[model samples]
Target chain A: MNGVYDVGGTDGLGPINRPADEPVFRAEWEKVAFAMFPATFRAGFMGLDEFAFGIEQMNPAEYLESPYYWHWIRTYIHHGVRTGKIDLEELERRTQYYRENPDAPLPEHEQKPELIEFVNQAVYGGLPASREVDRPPKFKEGDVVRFSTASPKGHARRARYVRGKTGTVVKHHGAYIYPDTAGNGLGECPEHLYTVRFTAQELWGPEGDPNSSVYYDCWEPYIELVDT
Target chain B: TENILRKSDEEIQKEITARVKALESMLIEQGILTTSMIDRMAEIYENEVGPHLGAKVVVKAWTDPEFKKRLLADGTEACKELGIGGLQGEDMMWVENTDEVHHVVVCTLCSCYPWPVLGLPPNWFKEPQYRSRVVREPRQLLKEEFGFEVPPSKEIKVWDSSSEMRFVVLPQRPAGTDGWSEEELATLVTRESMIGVEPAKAV
Candidate 1:
């Protein structure tokens, strides 16, 4: 099922505010948090799904209230706690140390050049979603298919707005790694992906734009052929 | 809890930054990371990727028909041919804006993007309003929010880039620029134009 993270057609979100000059990050430490995770992942500390679900499990208020990078910060801690990669007591101790010693210099540890090279390589491009698989596409282009209404309990690529809506298949994107299964550590579980086209009437009713269409890249499990 | 007080978004953001700094130090002390690793990572996100790269790619497509054909055929490879495409842009696909059709990229699930080319995503692209409204009522949203109205005659296609493959629009070349060099053309390609929220800058 779609959780708080699935924020596609719901309303009341305000204007998109941007300053004249947009910097890469708001502060220096945000960069550290941003870089740390991919480095942590390269070190084999946690998987992407574990991190995503960890953020999902955060208190809803904290999840919505905090800035985006905060999600990464909290998710890192959550994975460490669950995997026992870190000691909570020691973490608290470190927090307390920094809170009290606000002006003190933080210590640095020696880094391996090889590991730095690996982190540099992995973070810029991100992991690929394409995968080798054995499944033939159940639906072809021009077929009117409906996305599954069944709520998946874990991370999924299916958005909330498109569920149970009828749309025509526009293309076969070949097989890609299925997020529903892959995000839960269930192996690649690769499946066919299709671009589904929904008209304004089908998705948003008469209030929607009459001249436009929305295309979604949908995995096989998220859709089924609609009765003609 | 007494230590915590009401603060602005930036204030809270700064506080989280400090907390993350502490976490970074702890990671270092625990032998999980090194200062040089952060440096290497910083260089990639901070400078090696972003909009200038995208602008350059768009400029070439505007000036060279053969390159444009190749770009449309395989954007990722074409971009790499010109020294772009890696990381988030490893599987990019180019969508062009013609007289009949317009392309805009949006990721409703979250702000997935071709960061290697477009730099960091602008805040609006990641916000919920643009994400939801763009797909549902793109014409109205474009007119009201961005002040760029699409005429009824032109079909608006909203490309929902929901996964690894990122989409960048090759905005229609502006008029009166027939004699301009690639350098001048690149300057006209704004991030908004490439995102299809705005038309190419007038020459």
Candidate 2:
């Protein structure tokens, strides 16, 4: 991950020239969708504490089927309502009314939106410049990693399906910085980061090529080396 | 009694400038790395951080036949050959241009671009003018804004690779290339060609 470009900037080493024969989904399309929901979406899946088993168990088809914001919106509803932080009926009613009467001037509801963080309330803070990771190594430079099959409820970046599976450690992202859970971007909980390599064969069975693999920036707790 | 909607656009721009400057001033005061460093960092980030790993892959595909086939067939992993990464397990296809057709990408609702291949999208990507006009009158928008006079020989095929998955344009191999190294080919890849501006033809 050292060479991975931190391309959150508007300009940086912007990709110039036409790349020949790259895949789709490589282009950034700023399409943020947030419609009403009928889900008791799950929550607390933070970057810290690692991800839970159930969340990691999400089907690949489902992951690919839904859009990113859909996941956000769904997860929001799942956790927000399931935890009883907000009543389901009231939410449903509010959503319905908002949809049906898009043009109507309604009374200003006093309920605030999610917490909003000011600038630089970002994830992956204070990572070392040399390592391009959050903190120092909890695992060695060439550790054989094993992410927890055990689910840790909170916000996280590791996908549900990739959980508990063993792979070699690739990028060493330090700490356990949490991705802003509020969706409104208010929190800044720093966490360790590391990148784990999952071979395509390991991820996809015989259909996947043995040599081709992927590396993910990962944190510990979600991982333990084999036979540890 | 304030009518914000009635405020001139210049007022909004000035207000935004003031707010941003004030925010920067506070950050400097709070010792969140000096203000000058932030500005320098912005410059560094702009010049150094990205438009990442794009040309590396483009050139690889040009040089390697098997990789080119894999890229044309399955864009995601083929990209990995050049060390490009993106949303995993998810299928991403490469759409190449023929002499017959051209493709363009847009995000209708908001700007949601693939962060793995090409970094963040340009400011024009999110603008209402770009969004509304690109879809409805792409030729006019391209002509007026970008001065593109797409040739009559090519048909346009626009894909909204916004919500589903991101896309990259695979242009026809540049002409007059007897044997170019992957690095040499990569150096020739341009952003506009990826976004479907000019055909990836060697000058």
Candidate 3:
């Protein structure tokens, strides 16, 4: 999709700012969004990959425009609607309620008795995506490979910078669910994941720092062996 | 205080809380979730889990060479031995900082983090600024932004974590703490140091 989410190797992003002793939940909404993941997923609305895909469903402008937690909220709302769990019209009506009546008291719900159970499951045992694949890894360590430059319409793990750029395969991470298919609910196509290392010069030309290199876990389908 | 240029931090958070309250009310009434579940979830992350787990592991590794080998060889299993395994930290990988190679972590696509060890990600870690710049010019980013400079001889390697595998940096134990106890050493481990953004503050 060529979304703005792909920001690696881009120029002119200023230096990082470290806040002094950052807290876990800076705001209450952050907690709700954090909890929303396990509850939503445990209810069978979506899988981890689909949840990520839902975040991608956000408008690129909106996705890039909003803060980090904003993506989690939108992703939850997206899957909620997708799985027939959340009624969109009803949700909008509630959104309007808060918008119009800013000073009104907020509504509350009955706390579930089994709430701790849900919390335990989420904190200790959220979904893991590793799976067994039928085929062996195509490329081995030291093999030169190039990421697929073609940007598809939906979610993909391949970052923009490494696309079409050549790198060397360093480690093969066995079989894992292929995100492109799993994301769309097409079902998991388990494939090998590989660590592909690109020298700074190889990725960024003469401007790149010659002494440094970047490594990405390139899935099997994302790359093709470059002819040495 | 009278209103100034933009909304104050309090104002912004208040508005956010209001919107979330609206959403939560609907979600609960619609049978999507219960209120207490969210509250409990928040407490677990905000208080129950965090860098303390990471620090405990780091301190153990510093004191026990056998444990350190296990930690570097299989981080997830080693962490589980200390009861630190779960959710965002299942496929844990450890990168050690040595005299030759130093490691840092970033996720350019999204904020793929070791949540069980580090708790929730800090705001700056998720910002485009850190994600974009760290992978490119990490040496300068660490020096200028984080106030820690890597010596020219030391190599700075950055790990871009995905959902499948999350990486945490095992920072080099700072000098002059040779006889420090595990509890004391744990106190020196900061979240930033584990992210490779800065060194653990010398005490």
Q: Judging by lDDT against the true structure, name the best candidate.
A: 3
Decreasing TM-score order of the candidates: 1, 3, 2
Please state the interface RMSD for every predicted structure, separated by commas. 3.0, 17.4, 2.9
Pick the TM-score winner. 1
RMSD of each: 2.9, 16.7, 3.0
Give per-model TM-scores.
0.92, 0.42, 0.91
**Interface Cα RMSD of candidate 1:** 3.0
Q: What tens digits encode model 2's per-residue C-alpha lDDT throughout A10-109?
A: 1222222223443322211102111111011112322211222122234433332233333343344344444455455755554445445434443322
Measured against the true two-chain complex, the DockQ scores of the candidates, in the order shown, are: 0.57, 0.03, 0.56
What is the DockQ score of candidate 1, to 2 decimals?
0.57
Measured with C-alpha atoms, the lDDT of residue B107 in candidate 2 is 49
Expressed as tens digits, the lDDT of each residue in A20-101 for candidate 3 is 6667776667888777787777677778888877777778755654556768888877887888877888777777777777
Candidate 2 global Cα RMSD: 16.7
Q: Candidate 2 on B1-203: residue-level lDDT in tens?
A: 23343556454334333322332232223233232333332332245324446676677777777878898777766876655553211334566777776666654433545444565455545333454434334444456665676664445554433222356777667887768776667666776667765556465
Give fnat of each prediction, in order: 0.69, 0.00, 0.67
Interface RMSD of 2: 17.4
lDDT for each residue of candidate 1 in B33-126, tens digit (9 for 90 to 100): 7777777777777777778888998998888899999998888889988778666676778889999998888998767788767887876687
**Residues B1-203, model 3: lDDT tens digits:** 13244566676666666667676776677565786787777778778888888999999999999999999888889998988888888787888988888788999888888987888878888877888887888888888887798986677777876548888999889899988999989989998889998887686
- Candidate 3: where is the Cα deviation over 4 Å? A101-111, B1-15
